[PDB]
Design a protein around this ligand. Sequence first.
Ligand SMILES: O=c1c(O)c(-c2ccc(O)c(O)c2)oc2cc(O)cc(O)c12
Ligand SMILES: O=c1c(O)c(-c2ccc(O)c(O)c2)oc2cc(O)cc(O)c12
Ligand SMILES: O=c1c(O)c(-c2ccc(O)c(O)c2)oc2cc(O)cc(O)c12
Ligand code: NA
Length: 156
Amino acid sequence: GVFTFEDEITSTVPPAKLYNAMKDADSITPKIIDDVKSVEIVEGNGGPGTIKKLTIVEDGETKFILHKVESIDEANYAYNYSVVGGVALPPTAEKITFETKLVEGPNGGSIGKLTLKYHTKGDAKPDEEELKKGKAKGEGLFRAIEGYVLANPTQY
Ligand SMILES: O=c1c(O)c(-c2ccc(O)c(O)c2)oc2cc(O)cc(O)c12
Ligand SMILES: O=c1c(O)c(-c2ccc(O)c(O)c2)oc2cc(O)cc(O)c12
Ligand SMILES: O=c1c(O)c(-c2ccc(O)c(O)c2)oc2cc(O)cc(O)c12
Ligand code: NA
C-alpha cells in the first residue's frame, strides 16, 4: 500500500535562489556532506525518468543509492524524485517518493514543503527506523544546499 505524510522546513534564502541551487545538488552535495562521494547519471538527460547513482560511505563501507527523477516544474519551484534502489530502499518497500515544493516564506525567505509517499510490497508496513534515519538525511541535504548558497552569496 501507500503511506503518505507531509513535513515543512524553513530557510532565510529566497525560493528562486534556493531552487536554482537545488539543480546543482549533484555537484554541491559531495563537497559539503562528508559521506557523499559522488552523484552520477546512469541514464537520461536530467529530466523525468533520469536514473542517478549516489555513492556514499558509512562506517568504512562503500554503498550506493538509486534515485529516479519523477517530474520538474521550474515555474512552481518543484522537483519530485524517488528512491528506487540501493541501501536507502528497504527490502519490504517498493519505492519511496519525495515530492518537493518551495514557496515564499515570510521575511524574504523560503518555506520548503515535502510530501513523502512510501510504497510497500503487499501487507508490509513502513519501517520506522528507516523513516527516522531518512528525515535526518533529508534535513542534512536541505541545510547543505542552503549552507552553500549562504556561504557563496555572489553565485545565484
Ligand atoms: O538517501 C540519501 C540521499 O538521498 C542523500 C542525497 C545526497 C545528494 C543528493 O543530491 C540528494 O538529492 C540526496 O544523501 C544521503 C547520505 C547518506 O549518508 C545516507 C543516505 O541514505 C542519503
Ligand atoms: O520540503 C523539503 C524539501 O523541499 C527538500 C528538498 C530536497 C531535495 C531537493 O532537490 C529539493 O528541491 C528540496 O528537503 C526537505 C527535507 C526535510 O527534512 C524537510 C522538508 O520539508 C524538505
Ligand atoms: O524518511 C524520510 C526520508 O527518507 C527523507 C529524505 C529526504 C531527502 C533525501 O535526499 C533522503 O535520502 C531522504 O526525508 C524525510 C523528511 C521528513 O520530514 C520525514 C521523513 O520521514 C523523511
Ligand atoms: Na564528501
